[PDB]
């Protein structure tokens, strides 16, 4: 009974693979038309025996309640790059878009979706990890890295969903 956090992080760790290192992984939502969908987020930090490390934003699919980690594995890949940027949705709420929820819109070079994560709690940890994941709030940030992702082959795309 860890209390304060579910097992998202663990779920990925099991699905991930040895030698690697899981840092954080929450659970967001994706709303389209009138069909609600559930997506499992994950962040993995990979280091080299020579120091030189790299980060990438892993995407894990999952059923409605397949969060457990039992039936969820790599579904896509999103490597942090300069073209990466997060945009808040027009508040027009009262003073805050979050509070009781988290409204964030990822505007990458091509990736453009809407994720609704739960207010802080386990979501806050994710935000901070992303910042250090490479951006390290630098005014001259511009050095994408993904040459090591090729290592990953992701689950078999035989889903035919």
Q: What is the CATH number of the domain that holds 18?
A: 2.30.29.110
Angle at 148 between CA 146 and CA 150, to 5 degrees: 90
Measure CA 115 to chain center: 10
H-helix or E-strand containing 49?
Answer: none
This structure was determined by: NMR
Largest CA distance in the chain: 50
In this structure, what token pair is assigned to residue 74?
Answer: 């790599």
Name beta bridge partners: 61. 39
Q: Report yes or no: 145 and 91 within 8 Å, Cβ to Cβ.
A: no
Q: Which domain holds residue 42?
A: 1-161
Q: Report yes or no: 39 and 28 within 8 Å, Cβ to Cβ.
A: yes
| Cα 43 to Cα 55: distance, rounded to the nearest angstrom | 8
| Cα 64 to Cα 37: distance, rounded to the nearest angstrom | 8
Q: Report yes or no: 126 and 43 within 8 Å, Cβ to Cβ.
A: yes
DSSP-derived 3-state class of residue 150:
helix
C-alpha dihedral over 95, 98, 99, 102, to 10 degrees? Answer: 180
Phi then psi for residue 100, to 5 deg, are 90, -5
| Cα 10 to Cα 101: distance, rounded to the nearest angstrom | 23
| Cα 70 to Cα 76: distance, rounded to the nearest angstrom | 18
Quick one: which of 103, 106, 100, 66 has its CA closest to 85? 106
End-to-end CA distance of the chain: 35
Phi then psi for residue 155, to 5 deg, are -50, 165
Total tally of structural domains belonging to the chain: 1
Measure CA 44 to chain center: 9
């Amino acid at each position: 009974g860890p209390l304060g956090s579910m097992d998202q992080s663990v779920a990925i760790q099991e699905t991930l693979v040895e030698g690697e290192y899981c840092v954080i992984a929450v659970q967001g939502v994706l709303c389209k038309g009138d069909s609600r969908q559930s997506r499992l987020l994950g962040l993995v930090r990979y280091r080299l025996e020579n120091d030189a490390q790299e980060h990438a934003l892993f995407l894990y699919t999952h059923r409605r309640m397949a969060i457990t980690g039992d039936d969820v594995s790599l579904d896509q890949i999103v490597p942090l790059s300069k073209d990466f940027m997060l945009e808040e949705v027009s508040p027009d709420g009262e003073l805050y878009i979050l509070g009781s929820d988290v409204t964030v819109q990822l505007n990458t070079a091509e990736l453009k979706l809407v994720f609704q994560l739960p207010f802080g709690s386990h979501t806050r940890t994710f935000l901070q990890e992303v910042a250090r994941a490479c951006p390290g709030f630098d005014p001259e940030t511009r050095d994408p890295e993904f040459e090591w992702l090729s290592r990953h082959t992701c689950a078999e795309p035989d889903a035919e969903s």
